[PDB]
Ligand binder design. Structure first.
Ligand SMILES: *CCC(=O)N(c1ccc(C(C)(C)C)cc1)[C@@H](C(=O)NCCCOC)c1cccnc1
Ligand SMILES: *CCC(=O)N(c1ccc(C(C)(C)C)cc1)[C@@H](C(=O)NCCCOC)c1cccnc1
Lengths: 304, 304
């Protein structure tokens, strides 16, 4: 029993972290096979940040201008190319610690773990969610760029995020491992405001199921609702609309607890309308939305 | 910016996890040098749990009765001894992945990361605190016993906890790596009720400093207090008494933000008396107490 915000074990990703320096800018890189992936803004100088022309800035850079260090040993760069907002630095050595891996582009609401690094060294690991406005609420300081987000299926690490920047509001923006940003953000020091950070409704429902499985049942009401009635309340509270795909995804949680998904929606509706009244659910005073239905099943079943 | 509940990178501990089986009971073991540490209740059968005499049960066990598996390869057990509530299984092979390590016994309020394992394989990592009643609120299912808690100082892993059991209330109990339980708990299936789970006041204050550093300042009031006045309010709200040692420990956070520790105590006092009024601090609707002042400094400075 007990339910925690849990990240994947980070060892497989720790063995991929390298330090990338270009000029006087140092950030993190991800070393998979003989390629090191890093944010292309590693080539930007103090002020280039305002309006960078990456193709132009890259012309003044050769293989020898990218310094890659793995541990305390230097890697030889034999090629470099820009793919969208990431630089791919071909090195002469395949990473001996390369795990089985995939590059995936996740949808909003999906969770992943982040291994926060500085100077190619890991400092910590935490669990995140891709917000519905395509930002992430991470914990990233200067030099954390190039830190990655990932999920693990047994022995296969699926990399889904690479950190690039912090918006003026303190929220974070980044790309998938093909260099495409999540959302409308650009790697440029300009006014970029995020959209509405709505609550991931399917995730809140999964976490309410986790609470029931763990003995926290006080919020269970005597009511039911429909997807249409529930969604009218959800829109009012800045919650994402719930679809029949979400109801289907919650099916195993509904089966395990005997609580129909629409009954849990009605309980959530009452929590939104009445508040918590100073009560807590799984040690939290607000409705948690950074656990997917898959995360609830995984944690509640002990998937290794 | 951003402040997250962050665990230490788990790779160094992942390389120590093994599976230990005795009879029909399988749990996790920690392999450091040529010794495997595991809960001594691995020798208990279905029902022994009620009133086990470990010395007596151990007489019926030889080296060959402890099956240790690291990855998918078997380790040879050449010795076994009981130290308090842990079994130390001497194996013929030193763990090639042994990191620099220490065994430390932590005090209540101290935080650590837990690498939750099943069948010697890691499933997830999360950040915990040793509660003032010597329990931990973890996420542990059947088979998680032998999973460890740890802190990391650069390259030295300090192991502080080993999971042993779940109390009837769903909270967790375990030992340090010398087999001594934290608190009054025993490895026996009996009525063991935990004491008052008070709030770790120094940790709440550290987290209020983290919130100020991260832009969440709405709770900052125009008041100050004394340690004696503050403690009268703290006792009333089931908060741990704050000492001059705690004020000293928060000194760097006070210096960085320019907010005197007693002024932050007065702000905390008003939050206790007035409530949050539907507001949030660092995305939380309650006062977080599982970040030590050291954790706040580490995360806010980027210690690797
Ligand atoms: C990667 C270095 C860094 O820390 N950092 C940053 C990121 C991008 C850029 C470019 C503008 C693309 C050259 C410069 C510096 C910052 C950061 O994002 N600063 C603001 C950039 C403009 O915002 C619109 C950083 C700080 C904290 C966390 N993550 C990144
Ligand atoms: C280690 C196996 C296990 O899952 N487990 C457990 C622990 C200890 C014992 C003894 C009674 C010491 C033989 C048996 C089984 C349980 C657990 O603690 N069950 C209740 C034991 C008595 O409580 C007073 C376990 C389940 C979930 C999380 N952690 C442990």
């Amino acid at each position: 029993s007990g339910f925690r915000k849990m990240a994947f074990p980070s060892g497989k990703v720790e063995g991929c972290m390298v330090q990338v320096t270009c000029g006087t800018t140092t950030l993190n890189g991800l070393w998979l096979d003989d390629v090191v992936y890093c944010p292309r803004h590693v080539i930007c100088t103090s002020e280039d940040m305002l309006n960078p022309n990456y193709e132009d800035l890259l012309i003044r850079k050769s293989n020898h201008n990218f310094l890659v260090q793995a541990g305390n040993v230097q890697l030889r760069v034999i090629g470099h190319s820009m793919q969208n907002c990431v630089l791919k630095l071909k090195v002469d050595t395949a990473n001996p610690k390369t795990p089985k891996y995939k590059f995936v582009r996740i949808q909003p609401g999906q969770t992943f773990s982040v291994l926060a690094c500085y100077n190619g060294s890991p400092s910590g690991v935490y669990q995140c969610a891709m917000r519905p406005n395509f930002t992430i609420k991470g914990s990233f300081l200067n030099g954390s760029c190039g830190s990655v987000g990932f999920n693990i299926d047994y022995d296969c690490v699926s990399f889904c995020y690479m950190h690039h920047m912090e918006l003026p509001t303190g929220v974070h923006a980044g790309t998938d491992l093909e260099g495409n940003f999540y959302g409308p953000f650009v790697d440029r020091q300009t006014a970029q405001a995020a959209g509405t950070d709505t609550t991931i409704t399917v995730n809140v429902l999964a976490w309410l199921y986790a609470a029931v499985i763990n003995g926290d049942r006080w919020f269970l009401n005597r009511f039911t609702t429909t997807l249409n009635d529930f969604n009218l309340v959800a829109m009012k509270y800045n919650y994402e609309p719930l679809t029949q795909d979400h109801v289907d995804i919650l099916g195993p949680l509904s089966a395990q607890t005997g609580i129909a998904v629409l009954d849990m929606c009605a309980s959530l509706k009452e929590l939104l309308q009445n508040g918590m009244n100073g009560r807590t659910i799984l040690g939290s005073a607000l409705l948690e939305d950074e656990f997917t239905p898959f995360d609830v099943v995984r944690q509640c079943s002990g998937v290794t």
